[PDB]
Amino acid sequence: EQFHLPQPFWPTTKTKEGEYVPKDSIREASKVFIGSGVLLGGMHFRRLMQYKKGSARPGLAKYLNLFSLSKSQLIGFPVALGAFSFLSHSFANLQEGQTATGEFAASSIASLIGLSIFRTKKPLSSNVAIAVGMGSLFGFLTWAGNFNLGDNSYRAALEAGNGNEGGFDNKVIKTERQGFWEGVYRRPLSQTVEDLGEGRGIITQ
Amino acid sequence: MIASLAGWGLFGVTVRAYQQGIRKVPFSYYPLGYVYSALGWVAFGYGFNLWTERNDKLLEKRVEKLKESRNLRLS
């Protein structure tokens, strides 16, 4: 018998058992790593031609220097994203679906792999603090429901008959649990016991 | 309905009273000023109530159609 704790999670599209064909974790990271390497590598050479055309000009070198990537960054960035895409997809298959802790785990490690390359001359604690910080942002970005809840938004539930457009009533009790956005006047007591558990005033004293 | 224009006018007195402080003048300066600022907002207050009463008539009729549409949805 386990404990009863709250579940503060936004609704998600549940995948039926047997759904969720996994995606190639090697191939997916290969596209991002190779692709990002050519862009960052290609833009570097393009910015080198702009350096040759104008060097004595102060404003031109003022802006070109901002975009310049150190030799470590031109290598560290593609590796991190390639590591990020591999770990993000791999943890998606292990969980049978993308989760916040998977995205936290992928983002923090991938940052640590990347940060240890283009930020060598900094204490390892300084990197782990940054990598854990960047982990939280992807944990919260996934927990919040990506950029949009999509089908789980109240608008979608309302447009599907699962919203509170229909009012409430005490004489109509639903044996099954109500939807995420749905409200009711009265509930089956078995749902309260299966949530609160017996004890401190529920059923018994 | 005069009481509604009474409140709007009293808001007109406050703006002229609040104008005196910004200009840093005694609040009894140019007593005809309070009449002009009062009447200006009664003109606005008169029109504003006309606009809101017009909104009530329009919104009652629109809700008549929205209630019917919900019933078709709630079938």
Binding site: R155, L158, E159, E165 | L58, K61, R62, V63, K65, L66, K67, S69, R70
Partner: protein, 60 residues
């Protein structure tokens, strides 16, 4: 009553590529600047034109 009225107004009907408002009140091509009858591909007849979809005024 306020909760009812807001529930009516705040609701947004679903729009797909099947139902949406298009504000065209007539079929073009009745008269052209010149050579109105081209390759005779204008199968639309304006003498027996079916009624168009007039817009709904929800305040009327």
């Amino acid at each position: 009553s306020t909760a009812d009225l807001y529930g009516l107004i705040s609701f947004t009907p679903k729009r797909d590529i099947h139902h949406y408002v298009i504000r065209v009140d007539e079929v073009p091509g009745k008269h052209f600047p010149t050579n109105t009858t081209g390759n005779f591909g204008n199968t639309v007849d304006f003498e027996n034109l079916e009624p168009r979809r007039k817009p709904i005024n929800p305040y009327l």
